Design a protein around this nucleic acid. Structure first.
Ligand SMILES: [Zn+2]
Length: 250
DNA sequence: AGGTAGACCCGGAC
DNA sequence: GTCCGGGTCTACC
């Protein structure tokens, strides 16, 4: 899921787990657990803790317990469900938090690609994976000035810049391509080549792309641009498949 | 050290 | 049967 859908998950999941107490943690694929390094320590430490809150930082969910925070990333295909311990698990379930009321929070992922870290709550923001994360794109902390100051000092393309999680939280390949289209800027342009006007327009369209979230360019190669009718093109930029309108973007 | 490459994962596309 | 697609971290120069 993208940032908007993670926010929806955050809002939906919270009432389904708040106030529940962890009785067991069952791990079927240890490598999902990134901290502590031993999945057995990860499981052991969570037992007896009650879920108190659920926050979002970029595409990360931060589960707040009594002492610890669980930081979880679903990437593209991960899913959470709350369901009864009496019922069979869904296929591809890798980690289950069992609660004392006989319900469970389950993480499943056909791609097995997600990650989980647990630290004392007070340490979570200064450790991976949250430590270097840039500002929320819908927050005043993400501004044209912030974007401009990062763009000026780099040799990288504008696409590589917007994909950098330290610049802004939660912009992945789809919203990067779409925002750049909406701003009229080619993804391969050096970040340092953008004028003040272009930086300001790009900020505006990034906020709009995220705020709104239905595609102009992503995956639309060889089909007509919805604004000018020119066929959408696809190339590699910053090591990613990159979609753009060669007329609308400059 | 700024910035790219490696690593993780595997359904489905070639 | 080999490889893309996806995000975000660690490992290099
Ligand atoms: Zn166009």
């Amino acid at each position: 899921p993208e940032l908007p859908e993670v926010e929806t998950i955050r809002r939906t999941l919270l009432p389904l787990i708040v106030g529940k107490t962890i009785e067991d943690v069952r791990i079927f694929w240890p490598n999902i657990i990134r901290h502590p390094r031993d999945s057995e320590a990860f499981a052991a430490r969570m037992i007896g803790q009650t879920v108190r809150g659920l926050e979002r930082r970029g595409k990360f969910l931060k589960f707040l317990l009594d002492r610890d925070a669980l930081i979880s990333h679903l990437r593209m295909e991960g899913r959470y469900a709350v369901a009864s311990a009496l019922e069979p698990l869904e296929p591809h379930t890798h980690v289950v938090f069992c609660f004392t009321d006989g319900s469970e929070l389950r993480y499943r992922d056909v791609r097995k690609f997600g990650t989980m870290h647990v630290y004392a709550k007070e340490e979570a923001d200064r450790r991976p994976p949250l430590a270097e994360l840039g500002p929320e794109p819908l927050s005043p902390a993400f501004s044209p000035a912030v974007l401009a100051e990062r763009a000026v000092k780099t040799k990288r393309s504008v696409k590589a810049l917007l994909l950098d999680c330290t610049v802004v939280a939660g912009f992945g390949n789809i919203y990067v391509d779409e925002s750049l289209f909406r701003a009229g800027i080619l993804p391969g342009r050096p970040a340092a080549s953008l004028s003040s006007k272009e930086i300001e327009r790009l900020h505006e369209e990034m906020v709009a792309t995220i705020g709104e979230a239905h595609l102009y360019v992503y995956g639309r190669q060889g089909n007509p641009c919805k604004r000018c009718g020119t066929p959408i093109e696809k190339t590699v930029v910053a090591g990613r498949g990159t979609h753009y309108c060669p007329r609308c973007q400059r």
